[PDB]
Amino acid sequence: FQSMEKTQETVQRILLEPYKYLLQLPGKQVRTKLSQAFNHWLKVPEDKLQIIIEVTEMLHNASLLIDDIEDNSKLRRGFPVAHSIYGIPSVINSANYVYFLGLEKVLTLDHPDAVKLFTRQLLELHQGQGLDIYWRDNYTCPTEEEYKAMVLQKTGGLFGLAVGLMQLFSDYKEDLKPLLNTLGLFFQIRDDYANLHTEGKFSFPTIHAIWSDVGSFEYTRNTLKELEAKAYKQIDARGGNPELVALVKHLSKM
């Protein structure tokens, strides 16, 4: 009656706490820098942007809560992972609810293909997470070619959501999927290299070593620069973009 509507509204506050626990962790205020850069082509409406951002950022973190459980991570960016605090069921709930609150949010774009797209990209992400666990469960390191596959499914899976949602809400229609893989790998491999120089996570240098001390760092350096090159050569054939290339050349520090 009365008491049930209080006890219910409460549960929704509670439900977001693991999601919030992940928001507050250090860095990943730099995601925002990136989508803003992409808007120098898409010229998207400020109000559709804020929702595409809200969504992307919801799906991301909900997807990390699961990824940590699934990877049996112990820490994330140095702090304990969400499940070791709130506990697995409490987390599963929060991520899943947040994913669906993000559906609800995409519905507000009022665009039938946006749900179509969200659904595809999530389905993709789950297959990535799929493989990741498959390998883990079978005590197996994936090959370099397979590692990249998983990243484009998981990472290009959720770059591609955002850039693709925005491109729905733009008269810009030239092909960024090419550029987005080049960035997806770039970002990942970099964050792998940085992180080393794992937490139950397959990482580009460890994989290259394992498929012969080794100087995978030497190879990873080489492999990273080589993408950045293809970043610029595909950035240009899309009429160029100052904001983005600033954020690339900045990041090529590591």
Ligand X SMILES: O=C(Nc1cccc(-c2nc(NC(P(=O)(O)O)P(=O)(O)O)c3ccsc3n2)c1)c1ccc(F)cc1
Q: Which of residues 44-73 bind a copy of itself (CB under 8 A)?
A: 66, 69-72
* Distance of closest approach, residue 239 Cβ to ligand X, in angstroms: 26
| Binding status of residue 77 toward ligand X by CB under 6 A | yes
| Binding status of residue 104 toward a copy of itself by CB under 8 A | yes
Could you tell which of ligand X, a copy of itself, none binds residue 138, using a CB distance below 5 to 8 A set by kind? none
Backbone angles phi, psi at 69, to 5 degrees: -55, -50
Q: Is 76 annotated as a binding residue?
A: yes
Taking residue 16's Cβ as centre, other Cβ atoms within 10 Å add up to 15
Token code pair at residue 27: 């860095």
| Binding status of residue 10 toward a copy of itself by CB under 8 A | yes
| Binding status of residue 182 toward a copy of itself by CB under 8 A | no
Q: Which of 36, 127, 206, 234 binds a copy of itself (CB under 8 A)?
A: 127
* Size, binding site for ligand X by CB under 6 A: 18
Q: Which of 149, 209, 245, 251 binds a copy of itself (CB under 8 A)?
A: 149
- Residue 104 or 174: the one with the smaller Cβ distance to a copy of itself is 104
Which residues of the chain form contacts with a copy of itself (CB under 8 A)?
3-4, 7-8, 10-12, 14-15, 66, 69-72, 87-90, 92-93, 96-97, 99-101, 103-104, 107, 112, 115-116, 119, 122-123, 126-127, 129-131, 133-134, 136-137, 145-146, 149
